[PDB]
């Protein structure tokens, strides 16, 4: 049948620690069975940003054996304090949604 989402995984998955002006780039991978389509939806702390500018616009997929991976990336070029918080990536197939989270910290010092 081939409609299962196996998991949704963030990279880095934990311990992200940034300074003001530094880049945040988060990878989200949905591993699935062969027949699945995926739509990604991100939640982030800052109300500074449109989803459209943070989330990749290109198609990022991979097929191998009887599995597929779908990649979504969130990029903030130059973080501020309001970017500290929980980032959630949800992957939806229409049948089901699976999600994963990580906490990003922003320290108040200029980036090296």
């Amino acid at each position: 049948p081939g409609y299962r989402i196996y998991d949704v995984v963030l990279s880095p998955s934990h311990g992200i620690e940034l300074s003001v002006g530094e880049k945040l780039v988060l990878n989200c991978t949905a591993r699935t069975e062969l027949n699945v389509g995926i739509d990604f939806n991100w939640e982030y702390p800052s109300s500074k940003h449109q989803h459209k500018k943070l989330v990749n616009r290109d198609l990022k997929t991979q097929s191998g054996s009887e599995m597929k991976k779908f990649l979504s990336t969130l990029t903030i070029d130059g973080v501020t304090r309001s970017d500290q918080g929980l980032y959630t990536c949800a992957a939806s197939s229409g049948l089901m949604t699976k999600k994963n989270s990580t906490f990003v910290r922003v320290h108040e010092k200029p980036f090296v």
Epitope: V20, G21, V25, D58, D77, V79, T80, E108, K109, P110
Partner: antibody, heavy 117, light 112 residues
Framework: KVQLQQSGTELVKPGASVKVSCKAS????????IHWVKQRSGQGLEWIGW????????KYNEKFKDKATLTADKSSSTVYMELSRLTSEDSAVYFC??????????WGQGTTLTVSS | DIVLTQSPASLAVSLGQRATISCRAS??????????MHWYQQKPGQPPKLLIY???NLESGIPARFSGSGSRTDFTLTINPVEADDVATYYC?????????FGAGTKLELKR
């Protein structure tokens, strides 16, 4: 609407200092980093530095470390750039611009500085 | 400390033809799987205006006549076809590393 409003044209003697202002409105001031950019006679862009108003973290281009001083007044939503020990090489349009975490999204109208005796 | 070499300094194009502007960086402007290269347009008396962010993303409101590509150290802005409203100066800018740096600019004029 977001606007950045810059102070008017300045005519300053060599050796003196000038303090140029950028007034922000239409948004939460403390949340966005403000950058300054120099342009001589309508061609070429040079980044000077940025200021983060929430905690006043500042980063400079090394080329401008001795020349520019960035400050902010949260109560009036204004970022200032001071330029010291002026010479004709400092005559330029100076822009302020807001960065949103992706790009410069709003710009001031520019402030013309003319250093002259 | 990244130097951007933009060419040509000046370009005379006929209405309806293609313009190609190049930017070479002294070192990679890529990190984390992104290219931190941006393209601006500037007309006289006005501030610069963003066309393309991160090498290939078209800013909202910019026509698809404008197209960016490349990676690492070599980047291209294509304009195809050239409308008369394209008469302006064009800048590349990198945000991979501080200090932020711009190319010298390409001035686009019309053939007659």
């Amino acid at each position: 609407k977001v606007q950045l409003q810059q102070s008017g044209t300045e005519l300053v003697k060599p050796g003196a200092s000038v303090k140029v202002s950028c007034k922000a409105s239409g948004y939460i001031f403390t949340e966005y980093i403000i950058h300054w950019v120099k342009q001589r006679s309508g061609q070429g862009l040079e980044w000077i530095g940025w200021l983060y108003p929430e905690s006043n973290i500042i980063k400079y281009n090394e080329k401008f470390k001795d020349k520019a001083t960035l400050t902010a007044d949260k109560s009036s939503s204004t970022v200032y750039m001071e330029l010291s020990r002026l010479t004709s090489e400092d005559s330029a349009v100076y822009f302020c611009t807001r960065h949103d975490g992706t790009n410069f999204d709003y710009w001031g109208q520019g402030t013309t500085l003319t250093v002259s005796s | 400390d990244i130097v951007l070499t933009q060419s040509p300094a000046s370009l005379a194009v006929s209405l309806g033809q293609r313009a190609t502007i190049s930017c070479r960086a002294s070192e990679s402007v890529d990190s984390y799987g992104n290219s931190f290269m941006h393209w601006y347009q500037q007309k006289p008396g006005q501030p610069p205006k963003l066309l393309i962010y991160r090498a290939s993303n078209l800013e909202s409101g910019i026509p698809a006549r404008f197209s960016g590509s490349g990676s690492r150290t070599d980047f291209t802005l294509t304009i195809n076809p050239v409308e008369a409203d394209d008469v302006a100066t064009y800048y590349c800018q990198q945000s991979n590393e501080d200090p932020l740096t711009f190319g010298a600019g390409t001035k686009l004029e019309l053939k007659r």
